[PDB]
Each structure stands twice: as C-alpha cells, then as structure tokens.
Structure 1
C-alpha cells in the first residue's frame, strides 16, 4: 500500500570528524572511556535487527525468496549497465558507482596519482580513470594497484603488469598482495612509492555478528599500506563496516592525526541495507615518523585487538563517530532492513507485483543519481587496456 509509494531517494551520508591537534601517542592497554559502552550497545542493536532474517535462512526455499525480495528492493539494480553502455565505462561494478559518487562529492584536491589496494577488478581504478579523463582532464593518469593474487575478471591485471604490485605463485621464491602480512604491507608501499607522488590512495578490502572483528586485520593492513605511501596533501579512501570496535575507533584516531579533513561517508550507490562505510581522509597533513612506522607495522606483525591509542584522549572524535554510526547504521540501515522484512511478509509470494510497484521509483532514484554524479562519454583513447570480456 502507501508505504511503498512514499519511498524517497536516499541521500549521500557524510559525517565530519575533528582532526586532533595533540601529538599522537601510539599505545604500549588502558581503561576504555564510557562512550565505548554506547558503541557496544549499538553493535548489539544492529545485530538484533540483522538477526531478524535468521528464520528464513534455515530452509532453502524461504532463503531464496528472501534474496529475491532484497534484489527487488535494490533501487539501483539496472544502473551499472546503463552507465556502461551510455558512457563507454569499463568494469562498471557497484564499486565503480561508489567510487564515482565519492569523487563527485568529496571534492578532492587531486585524483591523478592513484594507488588502489585490495582491488583486482578495476571498479575503483576504472572509475578514477573515467573521472579523471572526462571531468578533471589530467594530461595523463598514472596509477599503481595491488590485490590478493586472484579475481581478474576483466583482464586488468593481465594486460598491465607494469601497474600491479603483487606477484603470482610462480615467483614464490614475493608479495602476494596479502595486506594482513606486515612484510607485505611495507613492501607494497615501497614499490608503490617507487609512482613518484601519490595523491590518491584507495582500499576496498573486505571478507555477520563479527564481520568487523573478522576484518580488523585486513582493514588495519589496508590502512597502513596507504599511510606508508600517501604523499603529503594526498587523499585516502578506505572501505570499512560498522566501526563499533575499540580497535577500529583507535585507528580512526590515528587517521585524525594525519589528515586535514576526515569523513565517514555512505554513498547512495553503497547498499543502504549493508554496514559498508568509507573513511575518507583529505589533504594529508604529515607523514609518519620512523617510530610511528615501526610501532604500527609491529602491531600488524603480532596482531591483537587492543586499541592503538588512549581512546579517552579522543572524546570529541568518538562522539562524531557515534553520530556517523547512529546516522548510517542505527537509522538508515535498520530502517531499510525493517523495510526489506516488511516487503518479504507482504510480497514473498508476489515478487512480480513488488517489482512492478517499485519500477517507477527505481527510475527516479537512478535518474537522480545520474543528475547528481554527472557522467560524460569516455573517449576510446583513454580506456583502460583490458584482457578479458565480462
């Protein structure tokens, strides 16, 4: 009924974090500030709403109908193919859309000398290549990349060895691109810096109750690789999830010592029903000291989830991060999860009718996106060289 015909486009969610003027102190364990119980309450609540789907997953019939309902409520379903044909875009995965929305919204000072980590399909790379040649008009776009060795579904790794920094097992002798290994992280940055200035670092790494806890070491390494290679004034983009763990918040505290601007973003192209978030750092203020490099790389070498800094020294920032969690996860994500279950209860046996109801809105939402993130045809001379088809 009416609850389907009033659904409006979501908005790009962007929450500014304060930079910390105090000197960074990498910790060598401490008592948490009280605001961490607020974060723990948010993790319990979000997992409660996420748990509302467990009954349907037990029988393969209802599990199927659920993933169709979720498919049906994906308001951006047909957009990737529309963007690909109309504007000659390449590797138009959902990450392409997310990267393109980020570039059009965050107003970076430079997107020209890019290091994309945990990538493989050039969704982020292709989007930056597309954005640079059609919007920024850099004379040439030079980029390096890495990823855990396959997969390369579009032949971007195979057709551009010069640009990829990981190694196939034929060279086991050797950086396989695994950023959970401290030796690899330092090597990746070193090779990357051997691209002379690096202006844009991006990492889309990712592996439900413990999704953030299971990705902590991955997201730690993907951030360390950027912070070891991003030049001053450069920009950083990192894929994350719930950001409720104390280690995660301490990592954000580190970011906030090295960047002029720091934002927790949630693009509309990112599914409103998932916890995926993007930490955007702008205008790198300074580089690591040799000590900061050693402590942090050692924390990865022998990893445990003890906070990296004294969280009690970052109350302002932690309140802003909670406001992000509240806005992105506790409000938006929970509302859409609830919305998906309402659709399931009323349309599990009427998938076609729900798709009919929402087809007009899907065009409105996608037309809005294309109006907000303006696209232009990418000339063939600037297409990335690809080795495979789909």
Structure 2
C-alpha cells in the first residue's frame, strides 16, 4: 500500500518557550565543568548526524544524486506557494525567507514591527515580508528600516536602489565595513550605524548561514555570535529579535541562548512550517527587551568575538531549567520532526527513485491542502503599489 502517502498530515508551527533568568548575568572568564545535560545534547548530535548520514551512499554517484534531489523536491509540500503568494498579493521578493518571516509575524504576536534592522539579509526576504506585513496588517503610517549584508547576493536590486538603508560598503571603499559580522569592529560599527540612521529599533532580524552536515552548527558559531551581538548592540528596550540557527547542540550555542534569557520578557525556539522540516533550521525569537548591555558586558562579549573560541559564554550549570527546555526544543524539532521527515524521504526514494511523476501525482492534492492551510493560518492581503519597495532588478 501507499497509504502512508495517503495519510500525510500538515506539520504545525513548533514553539518552545524558554524561562527568563532572574539572576545577574555573569559572563564567564574561565572554562567550567559541563552540566550532565550536555551529554544528552551530544547524544542528540550523534543520532541526528546518523540519520543525516543515511543519504551518504546516494551522494557518491551523480546519477543517484540527482534522483535524490528530485525526490526531496517532490516531497516539499510548499513548492507552489511562493509563486502563488507573489501574484495574488503583489508581494515582492517572495523567496522562502519571505514565507518564513511572514509566518513568524502572524504567529509570534510582536508588540511592534515598525523600526526594523535586518542583518545578513540579502536577497531581502525578511525586509519585504515585514514591509508587506506592516502595510497590509499593521497600517503603520510609514515604515523605516535599515539593512546590512556581507557584500556579494543582491538578486532583486533591493540593495542598489535603496542606498539610504544599507549599512554595508562596496569594495570600492576598502579604506570600512564590508558587512562581515564575524569581525568585531564590523559588529560594533554596524550597530553604531543602525542606531544613528534609525532609532528606536523595534525589531532586529538576522538570517545568516554558511553551508557545505556534521559541523554546520560548529562552522556557523562565529557567524551567529556576531549576528547576535549586532542585534543586542542596537535593539532598543522593548524591542524584539529573530535569529536563524541550526541544531542547538554545541555548548557555546547553549551558552548563547543563556545570555539571551537575561534580556527579553519572553523567549521561544521556533520552527515555522515554511521552514523545510527536513533541515535543521530554527528561529530563536525574543519578545520585549527588558534591558540593554552594561558597559562591561559590551567589552567582554566583543572581545569574545574578536579572539573566538568555543568555550561557553557562561556557567551552563546555572541554567538547568533553561537547558531542559532547550532540550525539549531539540527533541521536538530535531529528534522527532526532522528525523521523521528524513526517514520519510528515504522511504520515498526507495519506492519512487524511478517513479517521480507518480510520487508527485499522489502528493498533488495534499500539497494544495497544505498550502491553502498556510494561507488560512497567516492571512494575506494585497500590497498597494505605493508601498512596494523600490527594486533595481526584475
């Protein structure tokens, strides 16, 4: 039977709340003995990489490599939704970043989305989604925003047409901020520029990621640490935050969420449905910033980034409550949902590597059900022309 195909259900928005930390934040100066729960997080890393490694045999030959990627395309239930959203509602730059940001705004109930700093942003899905949301949903009289990104990629001309808004610089001005957020001076400067050009900043987002599958979190630690530092250097009190992450298993990643827990009224690890359930992408969301860094906290963290190493930022043993809730996040998102969708894909591969139109025929009705549900859950209205962003490419 192909009844397993017939019984597929939509996924849900997965949202795991985290406890805010009462005690004063003490930025660690010395390596400390790891809490026992880190051994649990390391078990999660090994197993998730075990299921990820299952596709290794198919990658060796280019022939099966192509069938594998066809199969993975075939089982993406949202494939047609970008083009649909784009035509129906005059939405611009409707990449997958657009859907993910739009779903985040419709679900997380932010107090304000009106003064946006979007870092590591190009091609520009996040700013566009927020621009669409702010004009059709929130009706802010005018929406000011700044952005930055590592210099190229601008696919829609959002950078070239809005030089007022972008804080990165061209290689011509190699004198200088190229937008690389792994560089400490670039981070402090990026935050300085954003606060000068636009204040308060009510919403910070960062959507960066290197790629090439076992060290993806390890390889992205420095990029994300600066992603975080940029936002936490610029975000006004009462502001909100959205950071893209991956597997959340490294003790530095866990130490970093521990820092977050001191600065927002609420904190949630999320996986929106428009984020592919087969990958490890996650979104750390903080609502309502309680306080800014103290001058010492600025110095310590920026030095941390300047001479980087994977020692935890804090004493993890002081966050037993928070680490358990993070583990519940990994279990739900990674060990349960992601592993299930990888097994589903391999099963689809084994029964349909040679029957691609057939697998697409079965899932066609389910794809329409899923994409319609998304549109029902995150209501969209048409974006008036006078509020489109000025683009420089088609």
Same fold, judged at TM 0.5 (above): yes
Q: Distance in 1 between matches of 2:301 and 2:242?
A: 19
TM-score of the aligned structures, taking structure 1 as reference length: 1.00
Q: Distance in 1 between matches of 2:175 and 2:372?
A: 52
Displacement of 1:120:
1.2
**Cα-to-partner distance string for 1:244-273 (whole Å, 9 max, x where unaligned):** 000000000000000110000000000000
Q: Count matched residues.
A: 389
Structure 1 residue runs without a partner (length 5+): none
Displacement of 1:100:
0.1
**Cα-to-partner distance string for 1:8-63 (whole Å, 9 max, x where unaligned):** 00000000000000000000010000000000000000000000000000000000
Q: Distance in 2 between matches of 1:305 and 1:223?
A: 15
- The structure 1 segments of at least 4 consecutive aligned residues displaced by more than 2 Å after TM superposition are none
Displacement of 1:121:
1.3
SS in 2 for 1:104: helix
Structure 1 equivalent of residue 19 of structure 2: 18
Displacement of 1:64:
0.2
SS in 2 for 1:119: coil
Q: Distance in 2 between matches of 1:118 and 1:150?
A: 11
Q: Distance in 2 between matches of 1:298 and 1:184?
A: 13
**Cα-to-partner distance string for 1:64-100 (whole Å, 9 max, x where unaligned):** 0000000000000000000000000000000000000
Aligned counterpart for 2:152 among listed residues 137, 150, 153: 150
Structure 2 equivalent of residue 178 of structure 1: 180
**Cα-to-partner distance string for 1:364-387 (whole Å, 9 max, x where unaligned):** 000000000000000000000000
Q: Distance in 2 between matches of 1:199 and 1:330?
A: 34
SS in 1 for 2:310: coil
Q: Distance in 2 between matches of 1:108 and 1:130?
A: 15
Q: Distance in 2 between matches of 1:24 and 1:73?
A: 44
**Cα-to-partner distance string for 1:146-176 (whole Å, 9 max, x where unaligned):** 0001110000000000000000000001000
SS in 2 for 1:213: helix
Displacement of 1:338:
0.1
SS in 2 for 1:296: helix
Structure 2 equivalent of residue 363 of structure 1: 368
Displacement of 1:7:
0.4
Displacement of 1:286:
0.2
SS in 1 for 2:291: coil
Structure 2 equivalent of residue 64 of structure 1: 66
TM-score of the aligned structures, taking structure 2 as reference length: 0.99
**Cα-to-partner distance string for 1:161-219 (whole Å, 9 max, x where unaligned):** 00000000000010000000000000000000000100000000101000000000000
- When the two chains are superposed, the root-mean-square deviation of aligned CA atoms in Å is 0.3
SS in 1 for 2:222: helix
Displacement of 1:319:
0.1
SS in 1 for 2:116: strand
Structure 2 equivalent of residue 295 of structure 1: 300
Structure 2 residue runs without a partner (length 5+): none
Q: Distance in 1 between matches of 2:119 and 2:173?
A: 20
SS in 1 for 2:117: strand
SS in 2 for 1:96: helix
Displacement of 1:122:
1.4
Q: Distance in 2 between matches of 1:45 and 1:141?
A: 45
SS in 2 for 1:307: coil
Q: Distance in 2 between matches of 1:97 and 1:254?
A: 28
Q: Distance in 1 between matches of 2:123 and 2:39?
A: 39
Q: Distance in 1 between matches of 2:305 and 2:219?
A: 14
SS in 1 for 2:301: helix
Q: Distance in 1 between matches of 2:239 and 2:199?
A: 12
Q: Distance in 1 between matches of 2:186 and 2:214?
A: 29
Q: Distance in 2 between matches of 1:189 and 1:70?
A: 39
**Cα-to-partner distance string for 1:322-378 (whole Å, 9 max, x where unaligned):** 000000000000000000000000000000000000000000000000000000000
**Cα-to-partner distance string for 1:214-242 (whole Å, 9 max, x where unaligned):** 00000000000000000000000000000
Q: Distance in 1 between matches of 2:344 and 2:26?
A: 44
Q: Distance in 1 between matches of 2:274 and 2:140?
A: 26
Q: Distance in 2 between matches of 1:260 and 1:297?
A: 24
Displacement of 1:312:
0.1
